[PDB]
Amino acid sequence: WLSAASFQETTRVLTDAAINCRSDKLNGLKENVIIGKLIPAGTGINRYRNIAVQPTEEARAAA
Amino acid sequence: NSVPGAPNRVSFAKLREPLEV
Amino acid sequence: GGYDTPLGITNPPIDELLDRVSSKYALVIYAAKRARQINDYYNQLGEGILEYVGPLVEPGLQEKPLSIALREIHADLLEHTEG
Amino acid sequence: MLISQRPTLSEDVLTDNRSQFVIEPLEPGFGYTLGNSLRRTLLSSIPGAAVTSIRIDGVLHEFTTVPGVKEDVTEIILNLKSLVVSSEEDEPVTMYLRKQGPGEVTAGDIVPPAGVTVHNPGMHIATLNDKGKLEVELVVERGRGYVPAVQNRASGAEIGRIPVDSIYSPVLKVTYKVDATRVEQRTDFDKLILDVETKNSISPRDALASAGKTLVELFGLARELN
Amino acid sequence: MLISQRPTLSEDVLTDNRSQFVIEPLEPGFGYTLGNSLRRTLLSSIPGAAVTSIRIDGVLHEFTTVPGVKEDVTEIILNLKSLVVSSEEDEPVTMYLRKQGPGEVTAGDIVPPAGVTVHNPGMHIATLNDKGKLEVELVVERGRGYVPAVQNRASGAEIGRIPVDSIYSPVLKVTYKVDATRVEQRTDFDKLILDVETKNSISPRDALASAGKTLVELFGLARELNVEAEGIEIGPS
Amino acid sequence: QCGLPKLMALELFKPFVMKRLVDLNHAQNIKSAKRMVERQRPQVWDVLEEVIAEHPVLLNRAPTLHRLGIQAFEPMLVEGKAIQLHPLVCEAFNADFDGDQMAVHLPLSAEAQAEARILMLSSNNILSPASGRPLAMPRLDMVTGLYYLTTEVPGDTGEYQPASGDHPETGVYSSPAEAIMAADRGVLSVRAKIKVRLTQLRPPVEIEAELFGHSGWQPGDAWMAETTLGRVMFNELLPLGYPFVNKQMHKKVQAAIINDLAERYPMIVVAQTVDKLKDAGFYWATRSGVTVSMADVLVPPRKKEILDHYEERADKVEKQFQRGALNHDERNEALVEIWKEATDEVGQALREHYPDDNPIITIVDSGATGNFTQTRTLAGMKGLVTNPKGEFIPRPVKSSFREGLTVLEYFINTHGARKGLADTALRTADSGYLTRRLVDVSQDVIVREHDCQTERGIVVELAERAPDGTLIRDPYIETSAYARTLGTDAVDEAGNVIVERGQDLGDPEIDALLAAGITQVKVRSVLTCATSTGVCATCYGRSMATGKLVDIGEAVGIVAAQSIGEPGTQLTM
Amino acid sequence: NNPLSGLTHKRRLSALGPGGLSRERAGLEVRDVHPSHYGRMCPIETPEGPNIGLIGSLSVYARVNPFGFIETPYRKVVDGVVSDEIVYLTADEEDRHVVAQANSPIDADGRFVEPRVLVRRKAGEVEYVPSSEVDYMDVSPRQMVSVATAMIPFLEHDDANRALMGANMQRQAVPLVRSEAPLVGTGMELRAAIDAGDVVVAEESGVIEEVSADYITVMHDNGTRRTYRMRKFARSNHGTCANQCPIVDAGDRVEAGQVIADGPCTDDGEMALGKNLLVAIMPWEGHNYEDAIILSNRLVEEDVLTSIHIEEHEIDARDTKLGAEEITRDIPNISDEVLADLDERGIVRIGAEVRDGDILVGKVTPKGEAREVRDTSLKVPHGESGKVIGIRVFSREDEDELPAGVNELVRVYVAQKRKISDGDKLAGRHGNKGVIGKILPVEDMPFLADGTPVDIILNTHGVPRRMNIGQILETHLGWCAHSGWKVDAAKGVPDWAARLPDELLEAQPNAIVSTPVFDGAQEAELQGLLSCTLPNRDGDVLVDADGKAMLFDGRSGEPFPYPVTVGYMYIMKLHHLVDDKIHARSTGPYSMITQQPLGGKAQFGGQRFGEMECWAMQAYGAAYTLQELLTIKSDDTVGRVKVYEAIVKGENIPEPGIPESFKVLLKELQSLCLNVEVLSSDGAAIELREGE
Amino acid sequence: RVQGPREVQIHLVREVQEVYRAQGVSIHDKHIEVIVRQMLRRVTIIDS
RNA sequence: UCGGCAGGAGAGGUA
Ligand SMILES: [Mg+2]
Ligand SMILES: [Zn+2]
Predict the structure, then answer these.
(1) Of which family is this protein a member (chain A)?
(2) Contact call for residues C78 and C37 (beta carbons, < 8 A)
(3) How far is residue C18 from each of residues C25, G391, G620, H16, measured CA to CA in Å?
(4) For chain D, which has fewer Cβ within 10 Å, the N-terminal or C-terminal residue?
(5) Which of G439, G280, G551, G282 is nearest to F141 (CA)?
(6) G294-331 in b/e burial notation, b at 16+ Cβ within 10 A?
(7) Which residue, F448, F450, C79, is CA-closest to A45?
């Protein structure tokens, strides 16, 4: 309902969501922008966001 | 023209005018 | 390649920086985490004892940690794993 | 075959402001770059003198009118920009214009100091009816080029001084023409005819010699090796 | 008047016959006053010597192919016009090249007329293969600049004196670029970056050293109309 | 690079300057440094030259119709109050220089700086993401300069004369340096055909095969060229290993060269090559002699006769109607059909009178700007105009703009000149709502994996055969078959395979398929992907912006909505 | 802005208002040029934005019925002869008559020369009827144009869009410190300045008795004496300067209706909005690429394009519940070094140079009864400067009308002089428009054979594709007028000069000519005049018969290989200056409900990062730049301060929090009786109020 | 209903490309397929 | 240490 309420017809979608007691899982681009989180695309996905970097053994030993 | 003191600006017009603005 | 020397922000060339990584989305995180490690080393060396590693390559006069991180990546002195 | 005739200069005077100079025989090609080197050095870096501030008595800014003069202060200012002055001392010198009564204020009413000479004793500065007097104090200085107005409260001055723009170039127009000699038997050369027109402060042969000193002293950081 | 900041010349040796001189800081506008006149003084004032005519044997008419050699006369001219020669004389001299036999005639075979020298004696002129003989008589004179062939009209003495072009200049390619620098709060300054490439008979540094001696005496005819003229002093060295 | 005013960079970089000012013992406290910065004391103009070193900024112009409306540059301090923009990014920004404005933004953290320096840099974004065509390309002045330089003029100064008896070749040169020295003396023209010995330029394919055969070690191997000087000075701008071109540089040829360089070379040499093409174009545009005067707009020679003939043909129809044969629409239709042939005879006389060295001709013949309809309107006749309803007026405008319209012709010229502007103003508000509607529906499509190992696909036409037995290439094949992944192997006459499953379709694969008697092919398309959420990289294919396979995590959904809607204000229907 | 804009404002017909239309309801058929507009509305002068076709201008000869219907005059013709009787006709009466065209050959007696003429039939149908049915005729070729469109020379050679832009941009010019009339004009400029009303004219005949810079005394013939005062350096509605200067001597004889004093944009009684500059049409190193303009430095060293702008600031002294505000110099909060330019009343002194952040007046507010004095002083805003030229103080105790609740008023006027610089907008009368790309030294500029540099360089790639060829004709005629010409008549008048008057067969240097809007100089006449021009000091003719000249290169010295077009053109300065458009901000004031940065340049606001700009960020893949742009730079109240401290101290930037607008939205949803809650991974709704 | 799901996607991706190709605008077919894919993702129940 | 602020409507313009 958060992504549909910000597109068009706010009153109708809000009324239908209130009657149906809908739940939003916050798993889209628009909702993550609205609530202030990292979008699930590009550099915001799990594979790229959890990279661990450390110097190699030889360079650490040399310096 | 038609004004007491005005600079002399020569014109290329070939038609005459029967009315004033 | 047969290019002239790059100047400023286009050094090192990215066509060689992209040969050490899987895509252009992992290079950003690689560089941005090495820069933070370098900054932590700089701001903790003058106070107490820390656990990070300083610049593995010789810096300049006043160089940003991102440039040092990119130079370290280009010289094959680091290693990373993907989540 | 290599030539040996060294270039030689020669002047001819057509007036007291205009003159021509011939410089033969140059090498085939080297006839337009010497002309442009001298036109680009004659119209930029020649020192002179110009007025840099005025001080009327009764006025405070430049956006007002004096009583008895048919112009405001911005027209006296835009009419005091075509005054050809000269100087010999490296320090500001204060002139004085004090005229009153019916007439027309010209540039011959500025009593000069001793070392300053006005070269235009017939320009216009204002018109006076029988109800106004003009008391001006012009400050003359020396320099080079075009310097914009030196601000007031950024130089330690009072509240009556009106800064003015100063143009220090004593040269008006410069051109050249080349007469090429393209014969056979490969014996070619050139010939440059420079024309220098100065305002009235510097003779046409002292500007070419200040540009010849500037160019004999800028092309010397090249022959420092040999 | 003083300049404020004194310019300084610096070099940057790239190869052995190529450099890159930089002159900075130059007052706004003096980067284009010093560029074109240094390029032209460098490419049309240094004297030198070059071949101006040849007289190959066996060519009364049609200059197409010479008996024995594996090259047309135009390739012989192109190979006998890139010879770095030099002469310490005044009037035209004369050289000879006479090699007979299966081999490869090279620049190390023109016997020098006691006084003129060849500085690149390793270049290939032709390949005499079909058991013949080449006899070339060249005329090397001195001059300045690039002079196109001086087509003559001897009408008899020139039985076959082919006229060639003469590259008398010891410099081969000069290029310049004017940049910009900052001195304090004022940008829009200037910086000249020349690029002289010479031959094998002069060094790239004696060029911008003998091209500042034919311009401190060409612009010195003006500073003699009135000795005291209040120019712009540059300051002590 | 860009250019940033000093008074704007001082305000944008205030805390970094305060930190640097405190560090260098130029102040005591943070408040003292703040006051000194706010008072513009002369001590703050030296730290604001290493503070802004290698710190990118973002430039934006509205409307932002696609990705290239935001790009990252490296600031430089200039004098003035205006921002300086590169000539080659105006196509991507869609920005002229008659009053436009742009906004500046400053990244702060390490991740934002890395993203700006890697993902958004201007020298990394050259190819358009909707069609794969280059955007940072020479245009306008550069095209004219590079078309003037590489043009061969027959019978010019110092050209090659194959003479005999009197003198030899007389016009063969031993090096480009000698040719330049000759052109500095007036003996040789830049656009005159000559023969020059080239050493450091790679020969064309056929010349290389004929001379060297195995390979051309071009660092020091010499050959012979029959070209002009301008073509040599143009080829000295391309990379070292690029073979000699020897062609006149129409805009299509330049686009082809740039596309080849982008597809066969790294992305840094292309950025280094466009910058020196722009230099040569700008240098040679000012020495080409393109200028406008009222004695270059030549009029047709025999125009009044054509018009009188096509006016008699109309007065017969008029007589007829006066007596009676047609109603009204037949009249108007035959008048339209006479005044639609008179403008074409005028056009074909104007396209035969004009010489080929005219400034008005060489601006439209080089591909820079303009059509020939405008040239016919300016120097021929305007033609038929339209009424407010939208139908042609049976009376034409017989006078060009070079002779001046009358009062009535000028008045009736505005009926269809106001409609253009009003509709342009009303077709910009119905395309942005379509774009907003397209973005929202396709906002959840993202590349999620590398391969779904599916077997479905779609069939692509890929040319058809004529009855005689010669194949006709499909007119629309660059936008339907190129940059796709095969689904099944391409076999022919029950024989071997030429290409294998899972290979991109470039031009070599396409020509190999076509030169073996294959028309129908099966590709992999996004319409038949097996991935639950989002799409996979293999099915989507190749990314148009970079030219390689797609990256896991890209937002293929927003680019599809920012591509179909970008060019919707040009749909004049 | 200038007299032309003021005159045009009073002649506007608007289709909107309380009883008309709306910018949204109006379609595409109410914004069209109807065939019945001929002589009543101008088809060219109209706005360019969303108001295209909804605002128009009255024509020069039009007049209004006693009912509200616009009329226009015509000449009655009988038996094929044009008479001289004028009748005014409305659009409902002229559709039953055949009306001829203004450009129709008429003999000495008044009979049509051409057998057939172009007429206008009932439903705006244009036809070619044989001239024997005509019933009316136009009065002049300029009957269908307005007062600003009738000031463009060679209008019939320009496209409609470019003439539209030229007419719109002629009303945006600024007055300059010195004015000069065009070399090539139209003749409408004399009666467009008297009727505008920015000049001073004499109401009776007499001799001038006394003239000064601010008054003129005229003695009438009967004995009465009348004196006229002048407005010196007055501020207009748009911040420009309105200055009047006398142009009469002390003994001149003056006739009724003669212009006595000049005005803002007036030169000797005729409107002058620009200056005459020497032009070259050529590309130049890419500095005039894509509508840019290259200027010379002689236009800055000689004040050719310089204007004066005046500003006004006010403050009010009122009473309070804790006392009464008073204006005084004594302020116990600020030092004595910055209170040296104030007088004994708390105001600045006339002639002082103020700057940004400087002090203008000094006012304090009591906080109740000492040490109750606070500081509230009027200061110069950010990025302003200039001298102080006037102060007007109003008080209550000296019997002056004042709003209730206030005690004293004071106004301060600040003036500056602005030169030309990079980013300023220039224009012509034909649609040329661009910003200044570079300003060059006079030695770096192309120059003619006698050493005369050019003043402006324009590109040739923009002329052919926009169909405004009137500018090239204007440059040709301007060069011919500047140099002066003389037609040889030793063997009779040449064939091309048959229709020229006898006073146009010879002209003096710096002559002024006039080419009316639809009846002017032909092209045979221009081509013949281009080969008759006079030489200069030395007997040389620089511009040949084609209007082209050979120029030298000021940076290299060699001549350009081909001739270039040279001439004179009229250039105006537009009121879009770069000094009023530059802005930047790091931190400043914030809003109240949603704690986002303020908007606008006067309030030190930020720039909007809209919806369309987020799609580009999401298509690039930049997930961290967007998050930082949306949280710690706009709404994160707790992260903004930590970010500033980290930047100043040199540490790492912290992690963003949660924006406040989301909480505002949640309380909005909860106020409509909606039970919206934020759950966790195991229920147990989060408080979302901080406080711990 | 007459033909099937596979032919509507060809009719759509062709009728959309004709409009853009008439005026000379080049867009790849892979950009319209992404949007057409989202138009066919639901099923209407006849009997439950 | 006192002490200390930022909503709506209408009109005209630039790209
Ligand atoms: Mg624009
Ligand atoms: Zn798939």
Answers:
(1) Belongs to the RNA polymerase beta' chain family.
(2) no
(3) 10, 68, 17, 38
(4) C
(5) G282
(6) bbbbebbbebbbbbbbbbebebbbeeeeeeebbbeeeb
(7) F448
In sequence order, which residues have a C-beta less than 8 Å from that of residue F470 and are 6 or more positions away? none
- Tell me, in Å, how far CA of G432 is from C1' of I11? 28
Map tokens 């890395």 to a residue: F114
Closest CA to D24 of D190, D155, D210: D190
DSSP state of F319: H
Taking Cα atoms as reference points, which of F471, F546, F464, F548 lies closest to residue F515? F471
Cα(F555)–Cα(G610) distance, integer angstroms = 19
Q: What would the two tokens of residue G657 be?
A: 């929090």
Query: What phi, psi does G612 have (nearest 5°)?
Result: -65, -25
**Amino acid letter for position E208:** L
Judge whether B20 is closer than 8 Å to chain G, CB to CB: no
Q: Which two structure tokens, joined as six digits, stand for G58? A: 């009255």
Beta strands in chain A, from DSSP E residues, in sequence order: 52-55
Task: Give the one of F131, F442, F560 whose C-beta lies nearest to H26's C-beta.
Answer: F131
Residues 6+ apart with CB under 8 A from G257: B3, B4, G201, G202
Q: Which residue type is seen at G380?
A: V
- Residue in the block written with tokens 């105009």: F385
**Distance (Å, rounded) from C-alpha E163 to C-alpha E169?**
18
At residue E196, φ and ψ (nearest 5 deg) are -90, 130
Nearest residue (Cα to C1') for I4? G374
Supply G597's token pair.
Answer: 């940065």
Structure-block tokens of residue E92: 């035209």
- Tokens of residue G2, six digits: 């200038």
Contact partners, residue G351, CB within 8 Å, separation at least 6: D60, D61, D159, D160, G387, G388
Please list, in sequence order, all residues whose beta carbon lies within 8 angstroms of the beta carbon of residue G405, skipping any fewer than 6 positions away. Answer: G318, G319
The token duo for D51 is 């007025």
Task: Round to whole Å and give the CA distance between D37 and E32.
Answer: 9
Other CB atoms within 10 A of residue G405 CB: 9
The sign of the torsion formed by the CA atoms of F17, F20, F23, F24 equals negative
Whether residue G376 contacts residue G363, with contact meaning beta carbons closer than 8 Å, is answered with yes
- Cα E140 to Cα E66: distance, rounded to the nearest angstrom: 23
Strands G513-514 and G548-549: unpaired
Instruction: Say if D and G touch: at least 3 Cβ pairs within 8 Å.
Output: yes
Q: What is the dihedral of CA F536, F540, F542, F544, to 10 degrees?
A: -120
Q: Is D153 helix (H, G, I), strand (E, B) or coil?
A: coil
Contact residues on chain F for G548, CB-CB shorter than 8 A: 291, 293
Q: Please check whether residue D64 touches G, CB under 8 A.
A: yes
Q: Do H35 and F541 touch (CB under 8 A)?
A: no
What amino acid occupies position C10? T
Closest by CA position to F133, among listed F235, F254, F244, F249: F254
φ/ψ of G331, rounded to 5, equals -130, 115
Q: Is F96 annotated as a binding residue?
A: yes
CB-CB contact of F566 with F560 (8 Å): no
Establish if F497 touches chain C: CB-CB under 8 angstroms.
Answer: no
For residue H38, the chain F residue with the least C-alpha distance is: F442
- Give the contacts of F205 (CB within 8 A, at least 6 positions apart): F243
- Pairing state between β E48-54 and F223-227: unpaired
Nearest to F551 among C8, C14, C24 (CB): C24
Cα→Cα distances G336→F40, G325, G372, G380, Å: 21, 21, 20, 18
Residue of F450, F402, F442 whose CA lies nearest to F561: F442
**Which one, of F64, F92, F476, F528, lies nearest residue H28 by Cα?**
F476
